[PDB]
Design a protein around this nucleic acid. Structure first.
Length: 1130
RNA sequence: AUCACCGCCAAGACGACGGCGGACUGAACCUUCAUUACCUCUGUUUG
């Protein structure tokens, strides 16, 4: 929360004797504190609210700073006087006086006169003191102007009797109870900020009769003129000032009051809602409507309706939206409640903990629905690539009947299967009848995964539904259509695949380490212990934490912190450095020692460390947490040492609560995720740029990296893996030909449903499998979930979840085992079209360890994924438009030509790093024109190399395909929300209401149209990609998706932002124009990477050199799939 | 559309023309992979 910068989270629970939700504050994740009590007594929160109160009487300098002496003295006088009051009030301790003064004067407390010419210097006094008067100066100065009097008024306002901004008391009660000050009033307002459980406050308390009276004169058009007049005045300044909604708010409020007076003869708004419809109910809703419009950060004025017609339409749509938001909320709670025990109104899922539980479940569902949409697309290409089979679902009874009846189709599918399964001797000798059973089963296993409306819960009912479908080896009946019985062989073949992959795991894990030279850089005892630990973590494991960062990023952070502290004279700060190695650049992995160290570290981190760290508590957790905080504080004080109050500065990490005693790392990492969600929203408020928001919110992620870096180092030392850290780059092997240990048995005991699920996973990309395990881990890590008080209920639940996890892990650890060192299991001939000369494609990618070899393998795996979906039909035209020419191949060769001498690219790369470090080490602020010219020249060669590699090895083509899939994937995710909100939650909601609120049911029902449901289907089944000729239009898709999500404005509005932000993350800059409610005129450019940012030429001027990430060829491709064009700035 | 969206604090008199909450709500963030990979390191307070 923001209020007074008070620390802690808010929780909503039941317990109140009224039987309703109440919001409390928790400081350690466990305790519960009442808002009025806390916000009236907490030192930090009090001081925060006091200074906020002072800031509205006398403003501090704008920061979006340096005050005048007049301004400074004014703030100081008021501060001192107010301090004296609250001190004597017994609200303020002497201990906290310094904090109060630091926060009264955040700009600093030591300045020389304004005409002095000193380092720290006041601004010249303004011509009028009113320059720094705030909105509340008038109200607080009614009983005089002196500091003593301003302070007295502020104190009364905050702690005794709340005033309006005009200086009048807000409340004049006649009862036994005195009216509160602002602090308590606002705190009570927070206390009752809880989810509505019913429809009471959604009824519209006015109609046509009220409209006739109220809109005799068009208030909306006149308010619109207020907005235009506000715009013009701000636009009249030489620097064009933009008007915010917060500045418009008072002008609209006055205009609306004058309107009420015109209608009623009075400005008194107080009305009687219970008495029935009224003009003042309508007015209250008009005020609320403009309150919403004025809360907008961007272009508030532009959104103002121009007309009574527009205003009433906005009010209607907003009302319709709020009803559907409330009905989705209710229907979701009910769905998660089920039967349980309790009284829908008292359900755990109304609470903050319960809503967090819902959120992580819902996200798992999205990922699940998403993974099996891709599976569907994969199975389509497997079975019916040319669409020989208006239901577009191959698993539907009508279509699956056609598949099995077609003998050639089934046979051709079995012959193509290698692209999905790899080499599968297990499936070779089923026979034609056996094959038909097998193709049928996988379609039914897909359907069993895909046709689930489910959620996560303590019973693991979801996995039970999965098991019910996937344990089947027979379907239907003999007397009726679709009788399929799997043959004993077909069954054994299904069960054998997962069995053999498991059996093979031990030796694969050994070979992985062996092939990365790990056994060459470790004693036999050390290597043996490492290998044993890795296999043990995969074979027998509890549900671990996915909260761990990626090792590379952890290592990057550790490297960055090490680098800074090692540059400081104060050696005490060197303590915050680890001996963890830097992250390797890809080229550095060519060095055996470097590979060995990184792979050993990577496998250790992901498996044995993750297993160990997840359940850790006490000193092993608290030690690294504290150290991470100490480090951030040390870093902050060093960087900003010159700035004010530097000796008391703490890292922003210090706001975060320490781990509780008995809390596991898994639990503390999950709590931290809550902080991140909150921090991103807060940052988006200060700046709406998603990437700048991420930078300002990154301190949380950097705390986790620092904390985990210290834990990882500690673990390495504690378990005797120090040797890994001691391997130095370029070191020659300890043993030239080491004797490896025996492979450990990795055999498992798998149920049929696991084997079935495992085979369906072969139609889902590995990344999406990984995402499923990551979310499963996140959901399992969640504290405060609904549980059972049924003793063995949790034992069965835990068995299902463990078996599910084993399927995912085995799939991931097996990776390319059935593909490696074998020919491409698909036709490469269609991909010749991507080259001008087909012979050139053949020479490069059609076979007749090294770095060129790894690159060819990467490309072929890329093409495989396109073939897996049968997507050459979708992007053949576009790809063939951007054919790779022989001159590009030749140019790339000569740039990389290493046979005679240092190749062009290697020379360029080394010159660039050489110069960068020379600048950043010897003089980070400066660079000579000649140094800068060679730097630019190096970048140019580097760019040319990147662009040619991107074309010759088809990087551009594969990135375009991936981008396309990601965009459509994001829209499919929205489609899942449509299906689920409308098909489940709203239906549930409508049934609770019954005949009481038919108006709400008609509004719920409005969520659906034929076109929206069609868009849901077309997205789900990639029907938008089903065009033999031409390129897909993603702009039109986004527009269809916007319309699909119209039932929920927050989603409809977010649809385009999702896609923009997705591209931005990659450095692609997309822009649309909105005309007639449709996105259009898509343009594409890129964000250049800025080298030598704050570095100046020795001769003067910015020394900045810019690097392009992407070729014009790729930008053109991206533009084409958005039916747009490239527009690079000049 | 491109930070929105939902909700809370009612009046003894002319206003809420002011204050707020929000893992609570979408959007983000985080993420198995010897991937394309490039931006010195590091970051208080305000906002």
């Amino acid at each position: 929360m923001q209020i007074g910068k008070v620390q802690g989270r808010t929780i909503s629970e039941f317990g109140d004797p009224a039987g309703g939700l109440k919001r409390k504050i928790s400081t350690d994740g466990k305790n519960r504190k009442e808002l009025p009590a806390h916000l009236s007594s907490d030192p930090k929160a009090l001081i925060g609210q006091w200074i906020s109160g002072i800031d509205k009487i006398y403003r501090k300098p704008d920061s979006r700073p340096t005050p005048s002496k007049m301004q400074f003295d004014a703030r100081d006088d008021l501060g001192e006087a107010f301090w004296k009051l609250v001190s004597e009030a017994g609200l303020a301790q002497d201990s906290d006086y310094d904090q109060f003064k630091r926060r009264l004067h955040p700009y600093g407390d030591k300045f020389q006169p304004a005409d002095s010419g000193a380092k720290l210097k006041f601004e010249a006094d303004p011509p009028e003191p009113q320059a720094f008067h705030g909105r509340w100066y008038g109200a607080m100065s009614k009983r005089g102007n002196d500091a003593k009097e301003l302070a007295a008024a502020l104190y009364e306002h905050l702690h005794v009797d709340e005033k309006r901004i005009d200086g009048q008391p807000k409340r004049n009660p006649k009862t036994d109870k005195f009216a509160p000050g602002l602090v308590v009033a606002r705190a009570l307002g927070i206390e009752s900020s809880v989810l509505p459980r019913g429809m009471a406050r959604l009824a519209r308390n006015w109609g046509e009769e009220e409209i006739q009276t109220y809109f005799v004169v068009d208030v909306a058009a006149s308010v619109k003129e207020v907005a235009k007049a506000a715009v013009s005045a701000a636009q009249a300044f030489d620097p064009p000032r933009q008007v915010s909604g917060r500045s418009l708010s008072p002008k609209v409020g006055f205009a609306l009051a004058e309107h009420l007076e015109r209608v009623t003869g009075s400005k008194r708004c107080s009305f009687d809602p219970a008495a029935g419809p009224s003009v003042l109910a309508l007015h209250d809703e008009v005020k609320k409507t403009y309150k919403r419009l004025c809360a907008r950060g961007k272009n508030a004025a532009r959104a103002f309706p121009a007309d009574k017609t527009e205003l009433l339409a906005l009010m209607r749509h907003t009302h319709e939206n709020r009803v559907r938001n409330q009905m989705v909320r209710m229907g979701r709670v009910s769905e998660y409640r089920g039967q349980q025990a309790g009284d829908l109104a008292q359900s755990h899922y109304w609470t903050s903990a319960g809503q967090t539980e819902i959120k992580e479940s819902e996200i798992f569902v999205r990922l699940w629905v998403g993974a099996f949409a891709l599976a569907g697309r994969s199975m389509k290409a497997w079975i019916d690539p040319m669409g020989k089979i208006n239901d577009r679902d191959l698993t539907a009874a009508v279509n699956i009947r056609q598949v099995i009846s077609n003998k050639e189709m089934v046979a051709e599918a079995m012959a193509r299967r290698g692209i999905y399964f790899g080499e599968t001797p297990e499936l070779d000798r089923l026979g034609a009848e056996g094959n038909e059973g097998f193709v049928f089963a996988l379609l039914r296993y897909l359907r069993g995964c895909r046709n689930q409306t489910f959620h996560l819960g303590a019973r693991a009912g979801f996995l039970k539904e999965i098991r019910k479908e996937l344990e089947k080896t027979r379907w239907g009946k003999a007397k009726e259509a679709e009788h399929v019985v799997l043959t004993d062989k077909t069954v054994a073949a299904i069960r054998a695949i997962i069995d053999n992959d498991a059996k093979a795991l031990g030796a694969r894990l050994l070979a992985d380490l062996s092939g990365a030279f790990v056994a060459h850089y470790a004693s036999k005892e050390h290597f043996s212990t490492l290998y044993s630990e890795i296999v043990k973590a995969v074979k027998d494991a509890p549900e671990v934490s996915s909260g761990l960062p990626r090792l590379k990023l952890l290592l990057k952070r550790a490297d960055g912190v090490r680098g800074y502290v090692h540059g400081l004279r104060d050696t005490r700060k060197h303590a915050f450095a680890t001996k963890l190695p830097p992250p390797p650049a890809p080229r550095e992995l060519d060095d055996p020692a470097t590979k060995a160290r990184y792979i050993a570290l990577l496998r250790l981190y992901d498996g044995p460390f993750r297993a160990y760290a997840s359940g850790i508590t006490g000193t092993a957790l608290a030690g690294p947490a504290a150290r991470a905080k100490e480090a951030a504080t040390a870093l902050a004080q060093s960087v900003n040492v010159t700035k004010a109050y530097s000796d008391v500065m703490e890292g922003r990490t210090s706001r975060l609560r320490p781990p509780n005693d008995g809390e596991t790392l898994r639990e503390y990492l999950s709590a931290l995720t809550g902080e991140t969600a909150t921090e991103f929203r807060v940052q988006i408020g200060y700046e709406s740029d998603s990437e700048n928001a991420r930078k300002q919110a990154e301190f949380i992620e950097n705390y986790r990296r620092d904390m985990l870096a210290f834990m990882f180092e500690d673990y390495i030392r504690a378990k005797g893996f120090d040797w890994i850290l001691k391997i130095e780059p370029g070191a020659t092997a300890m043993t030239r030909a080491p004797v490896l240990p025996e492979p450990i048995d990795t055999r498992g005991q798998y149920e049929h449903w696991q084997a079935a699920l495992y085979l369906v996973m072969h139609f889902v990309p590995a990344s999406d499998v990984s995402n499923l395990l990551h979310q499963l881990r996140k959901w399992e890590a969640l504290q405060g979930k609904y549980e059972l008080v049924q003793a063995d209920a949790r034992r069965e639940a835990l068995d299902l979840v463990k078996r599910f996890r084993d399927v995912l892990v085995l799939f991931l650890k097996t990776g390319e085992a059935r593909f490696e060192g074998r020919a491409a299991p698909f036709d490469l001939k269609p991909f010749r079209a991507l080259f001008a000369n087909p012979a050139t494609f053949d020479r490069l990618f059609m076979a007749t360890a090294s770095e060129p070899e790894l690159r060819v393998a990467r490309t072929l795996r890329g093409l495989r994924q396109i073939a897996r979906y049968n997507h050459m039909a979708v992007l053949s035209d576009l790809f063939a438009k951007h054919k790779v020419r022989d001159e590009e191949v030749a140019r790339l060769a000569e740039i990389e030509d290493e046979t005679q001498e240092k190749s062009q690219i290697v020379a360029a790369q080394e010159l660039r790093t050489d110069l960068h470090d020379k600048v950043m080490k010897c003089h980070p602020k400066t660079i000579s024109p000649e140094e800068r010219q060679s730097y630019a020249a190096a970048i140019k060669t580097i760019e040319e190399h990147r662009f040619l590699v991107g074309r010759v090895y088809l990087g551009d083509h594969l990135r375009l395909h991936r981008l396309m899939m990601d965009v459509i994937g994001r829209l499919i995710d929205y489609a899942g929300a449509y299906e689920r909100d409308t098909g489940t939650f709203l239906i549930n909601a409508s049934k609770q209401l019954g005949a009481g609120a038919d108006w709400a049911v008609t509004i719920a029902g409005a969520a659906n149209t034929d076109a929206r449901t069609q868009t849901r289907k077309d997205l789900a089944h990639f029907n938008v990609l089903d065009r033999a000729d031409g390129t897909p239009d993603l702009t039109a898709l986004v527009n269809r998706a916007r319309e699909m999500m119209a039932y929920d404005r927050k989603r409809k509005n977010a649809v385009p932002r999702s896609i923009l932000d997705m591209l931005a993350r990659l450095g692609l800059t997309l822009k649309w124009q909105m005309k007639d409610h449709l996105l259009q005129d898509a343009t594409i450019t890129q964000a250049a990477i800025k080298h030598l940012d704050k570095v100046r030429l020795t001769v003067g001027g910015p020394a900045a050199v810019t690097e392009a990430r992407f070729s014009q060829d790729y930008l053109q491709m991206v533009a084409a799939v958005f039916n747009g064009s490239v527009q690079n700035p000049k």
